[PDB]
From Swiss-Prot, chains A, B:
The gene is icc. Keywords: cAMP, Cell membrane, Cell wall, cGMP, Cytoplasm, Hydrolase, Iron, Manganese, Membrane, Metal-binding, Nucleotide-binding, Secreted. Homodimer. Pfam families: Metallophos. AMP binds at residues 20, 60, 94-95, 206. Cyclic nucleotide phosphodiesterase with a dual-specificity for the second messengers cAMP and cGMP. It comes from Mycobacterium tuberculosis (strain CDC 1551 / Oshkosh). It is found in: Cytoplasm; Cell membrane; Secreted, Cell wall; Cell envelope. This is cAMP/cGMP dual specificity phosphodiesterase MT0825. InterPro entries: Calcineurin-like_PHP_ApaH, CNP_phosphodiesterase-III, GpdQ/CpdA-like, Metallo-depent_PP-like.
Amino acid sequence: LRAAEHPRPDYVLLHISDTHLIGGDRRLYGAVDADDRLGELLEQLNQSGLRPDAIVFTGDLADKGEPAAYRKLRGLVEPFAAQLGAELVWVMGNHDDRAELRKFLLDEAPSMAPLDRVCMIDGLRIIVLDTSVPGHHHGEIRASQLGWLAEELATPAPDGTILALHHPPIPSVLDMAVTVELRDQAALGRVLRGTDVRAILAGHLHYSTNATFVGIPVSVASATCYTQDLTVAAGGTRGRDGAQGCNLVHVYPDTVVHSVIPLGGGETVGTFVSPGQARRKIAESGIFIEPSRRD
Amino acid sequence: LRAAEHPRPDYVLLHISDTHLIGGDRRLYGAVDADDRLGELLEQLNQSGLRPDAIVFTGDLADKGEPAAYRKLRGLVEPFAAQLGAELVWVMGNHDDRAELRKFLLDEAPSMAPLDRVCMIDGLRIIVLDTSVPGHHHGEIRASQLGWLAEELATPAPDGTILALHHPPIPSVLDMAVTVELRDQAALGRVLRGTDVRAILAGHLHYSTNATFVGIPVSVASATCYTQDLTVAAGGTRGRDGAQGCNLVHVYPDTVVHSVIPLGGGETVGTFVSPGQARRKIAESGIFIEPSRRD
Ligand SMILES: [Fe+3]
Ligand SMILES: [Fe+3]
Ligand SMILES: [Mn+2]
Ligand SMILES: [Mn+2]
């Protein structure tokens, strides 16, 4: 047998975003059951057998920063993360409330300080940055946050770094996005350029998009609740109950792969290949896949 | 008014892939009407008012390389491209037949030579590479193709270069993909490293995914006919009638943005903002968007 072109990944992360849960049982904006949409996705991910190292939620967790929404989100997601053996990484969005998030999501004293955090998963560094501005919807990063980020990034991590934030430092194809985009991206660019940041995970746009920023790949996950219709009349915007899902992140020795996971379903087209049948077929094609360095 | 963080893009491209049309009126694999799926997408893109510089189809145009499929594809797509004022760029996939594609899609003498081509859109270079292997489904790039590519890339283009091919030089999250992946990626990497290639557009995987290859962003568009369900049992594969669409590519002075366009539709969530209302709202937020360098 000959080795496939790439080994199994070093790390696997789920990248979920923009859950927008509300307290109680009403439909989000009277139009979509955000709990049901998120719940269906989590159940599908659970049934798939995926075993990620971490699950990262890139902001807009609660639509109006409601305590009851955070409690519900925690009750849905914590058992999911525990069942998958995954660490859980939460990020602020413009809809969240720092104090209520701390209290009800994190069991931490309420504070209005930016939710900026760092952790390690073995050799991989994850930095959480808070681009939210209390009482506002556009993104900003304070000078103090940039200083902190620069100091953290002064040395690299063995497997490099993933930066998780809400407002992405990239252009949007939707004109309305400019009203609420991350401001003064140049200042963040000066901090990030030349560092070991291998991926910037983001949300906010409610559609799947990717680019680079000062040479670093940016990956924006779409939303679990509702998404932007990119077939809208040019210049406009329409959110819709459709195309929800999340992203899967694979960290390899030499690259990071982002993949869009739409909600499961749709009638089968072509042959369904079971895991067992796939193992047989791959061997019959004369190939083996080299194990992960972290197996 | 203050300027938004990014100007309008220099270039706009549609990136469509894996149409898999067949001759006559039957359903692809007896499961999905590929003509209907493609047709619906084209009509939605047409109605949106998008005016791309080019439309790039990254392979698997005809499912069995049928003359009748190429004739049909041409009849659907050429009027679409003409209506949008866009140039049309065709790329070979493993399902295509070089000779029949040349004859029926391009009005060119039948030849079994690789479909390797170059063109310019103003200052932007587009290179088409043929990763297909007649009679086979995996990807290969001949030594002669690599030499040709290296010679072309010996000098940069003013707006850099987009490389369009079928089999992407990236890992897949689906195990079965290894049986038909691009082989000897290292050799392509030696050619591409350090060149002015700003984006590698690809298909083949039938799901939306992106990564880097020797420091160059790779963007894989999903398929118009049927797509992979990434909530399938780990290790397996299931194609499905759902999540079809294409990608939109925006080339800016400093970055290239790829965005997933799922099929339009779904019930409206939140407020619909017309183009006119958006212009008003953006101005009311105290912002203007700087015009394209190519306006
Ligand atoms: Fe949001
Ligand atoms: Fe295909
Ligand atoms: Mn947001
Ligand atoms: Mn293919």
